């Protein structure tokens, strides 16, 4: 339970639990324990937080920490993604979102093919353990690619240069897949890469072998990576519909059982709960069952099937 209140980033860290709760209680409907007879109050708080987020917009058609703060790629694109998830759920101006996406396309497109966001991150409470600026470029390039993919179903016709940019990014990063050390960012980048189907063969072998002990995708420090790390692969394997390493993913998820919320809970928690959502929707408690039996007797000219 984290009340959505404060500035843009605090409102964001308070409202992504709203979305994960929305999905998890669309599968369960346990809103009773979301405040002890406070579900309507919680929803009202969520709505006022969303209204405050809208009020913090800028003339540049972007949302930041404040009306005066310089807009950035990561925060604005994340807000766009969440609103896209909630276009049919809450009052979302689709034209505003598409205009923001097109401004993102027309402004922040470096000729080098590597995208960078303007405002540096100061606090590590939301990013995680990647404060060091060593391989952030590839992660942000993958994030921009994911933004383009999600805008592909929303702003398909307004910008027609999307296939060319995607092809250029894939060609540039095709030989750069062999120059990464940290495992969880490799996992999320591979999930994005396979979201359009570009992860197979030896690339998949290096993907799997990157994790420690072939199962745990841990990095030095930030133990909250655990219930996070394999989560990425699951969604990646959700793109490949591979449920052979997903069970080990599940086993390593259950080995921590950390409460979470707050420190570093801005992308891992949403990703793991959406992954659980599609895992339960596609794979219920039961498994596939389909049999055909045919028996033939020596005294009849037909067979019973």
């Amino acid at each position: 339970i984290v009340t959505p209140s404060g500035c843009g980033e605090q409102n964001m860290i308070g409202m992504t639990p709203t979305v994960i709760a929305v999905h998890y209680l669309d599968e369960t409907e346990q809103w009773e324990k979301f405040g002890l007879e406070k579900r309507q109050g919680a929803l009202e708080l969520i709505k006022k937080g969303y209204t405050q987020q809208l009020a913090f917009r800028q003339p540049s058609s972007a949302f930041a920490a404040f009306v005066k703060r310089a807009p950035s790629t990561w925060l604005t694109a994340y807000v766009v993604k969440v609103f896209s998830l909630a276009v049919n759920l809450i009052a979302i101006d689709s034209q505003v979102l598409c205009g923001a996406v097109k401004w993102l396309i027309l402004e922040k497109q470096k000729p080098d093919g590597v995208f960078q966001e303007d405002a540096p991150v100061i606090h590590q409470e939301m990013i995680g353990g990647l404060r060091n600026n060593n391989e952030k470029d590839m992660a942000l390039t993958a994030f921009v690619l994911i933004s383009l993919q999600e805008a592909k179903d929303i702003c398909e016709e307004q910008v027609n240069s999307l296939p060319g940019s995607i092809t250029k990014a894939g060609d540039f990063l095709e030989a750069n897949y062999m120059n990464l050390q940290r495992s969880y960012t490799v996992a999320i980048a591979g999930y994005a890469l396979a979201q359009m189907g570009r992860l197979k063969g030896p690339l998949l072998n290096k993907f799997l072998t990157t994790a420690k002990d072939k199962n745990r995708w841990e990095d030095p420090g930030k133990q909250l990576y655990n219930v996070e790390a394999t989560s990425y692969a699951l969604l990646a394997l959700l793109q490949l519909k591979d449920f052979d390493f997903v069970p080990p993913v599940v086993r390593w998820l259950n080995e921590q059982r950390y409460y979470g919320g707050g420190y570093g809970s801005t992308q891992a928690t949403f990703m793991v709960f959406q992954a659980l959502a599609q895992y339960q929707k596609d794979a219920p408690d039961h498994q596939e069952l389909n049999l055909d039996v045919s028996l033939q007797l020596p005294s009849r000219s037909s067979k019973i099937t």
Binding site: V22, E29, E32, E37, R39, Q40, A86, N88, L89, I90
Partner: protein, 629 residues
Amino acid sequence: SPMYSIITPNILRLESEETMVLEAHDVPVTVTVHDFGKKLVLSSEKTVLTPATNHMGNVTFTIPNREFKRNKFVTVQATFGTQVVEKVVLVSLQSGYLFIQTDKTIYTPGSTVLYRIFTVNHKLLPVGRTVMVNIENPEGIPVKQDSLSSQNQLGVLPLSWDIPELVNMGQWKIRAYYENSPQQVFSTEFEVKEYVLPSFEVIVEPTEKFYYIYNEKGLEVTITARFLYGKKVEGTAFVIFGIQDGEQRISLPESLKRIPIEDGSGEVVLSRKVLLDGVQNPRAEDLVGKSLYVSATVILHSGSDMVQAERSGIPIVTSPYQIHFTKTPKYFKPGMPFDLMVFVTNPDGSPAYRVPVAVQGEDTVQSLTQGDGVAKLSINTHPSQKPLSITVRTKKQELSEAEQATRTMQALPYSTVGNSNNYLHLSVLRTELRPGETLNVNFLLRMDRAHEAKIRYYTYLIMNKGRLLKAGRQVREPGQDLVVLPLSITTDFIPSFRLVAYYTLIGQREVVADSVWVDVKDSCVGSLVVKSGQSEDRQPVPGQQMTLKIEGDHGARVVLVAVDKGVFVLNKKNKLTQSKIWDVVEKADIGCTPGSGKDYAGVFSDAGLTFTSSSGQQTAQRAELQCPQ
């Protein structure tokens, strides 16, 4: 402009028609239904409020869809020209009933089974939907399943099955349910066992249902056997007794008797000594709570037949009565008198008749009971806010003082603000209400003693079958303390109804309310009569013809079946009767408490009703499906 209030049913059932009561306390209002994130829009309605009509909106609409596959909610909102009020409610799936009829009760291998299915909705009217039916063997694994639709048939489905020649024995089951909601099922049982049809019937009966442990005559039973076509019988009978405990039976070998049955009449007597010696319990008082049963066998003088009859469940008790508090409000009334309704029954559950009750604390405060075994009493209050305990004791005459039943009950106070403390209760003789009669709801009232000349009216609602049947409005002029509602009881009120009333007072904000539970006589609203249109000369002869006369309402369908009366001797369980229908429809209501909760939210939410106000003076919510326990 001051306030706007919405009254809604607690749970709304999909694919039906529901209502809201809107009370502005010359404005257009609109209501709308949205899903829970936001699934476009479901429905909306527009209405206007007229001062000449006291500003009452009886807004009705039909709730639809196929996406509705745990439990889920829905939001209802309403804008009254300028201000919006909204509330979230639950949606359920139970959307009708299913009744199953079979021609016979016990079958043999090689025969055929013929059955019928009736489909009805909440109001008990014909409907048409899709149903599925399974047949289950004794172990549990289904043998045959099928799916059917009952469109353009007015709601009767006949079917058939054919038992094989080489089949198992015992109990078989039929299970049917709607296609939309597989969570709820309806079931029926029948037997499979080879037999041969008997020729006469045997009846065993005692003289007293109970058994007082202090009698020197023991227990006496009588035996009556008769042929099927009406003539008397002769023969010999063997009788034995037993003792029944919770899943346990003990046979007393010393109690076995042979008696000659002449003209169908035999007498058997059991004494104290045999019963005491059969068990290892010299202390008689340890026997209370254990039952008796008797078994008999009758043989003819020609050595041709053999019939067995068993009666089980003769209780052993020391008090020939019993007291209950199933339908008494639990929260008392500070200042104003508190009314109790006792319930007295025979030990077998049959309601008693003409037995007086009283209270040990007071004197001469007594009454009798009508045919339903219910007595009405009243008691004054302290009126200190300390909870009070009351006791009830039977005061029947011509009986010893040591054989009177009694019990105790506790009450809790009511939490008002500012000491308004206004209630409702009908001061009429609680008798056998009948359709077509009249009722006089007497508002026994006690406002604030200081400035009680400000209240102008009250609001009242009638609840039946989990829906708002009617909403009224009765006014009064300042300086009065008693008003009457002459209600006219119609046929739609069957089998029971709940009246809820309230009023609003200017403080801060005051709202006061109460509720009452009333019951009416039970019988089908229509009428079907079957008799013999023949001249009724003499008894018929095999192969003859006769005339059968039917009377019923216009434009109906009548289905018939004739069964021999020798089958019922072998197995006489699981039949169809109107009492079963009323029991089934009554057992699935919403509000299970008699009424008069702890406060206004309590009384409104304990009768399956929801009240929302523009000032935020709302009620709590519920998200389960059945009341506790």
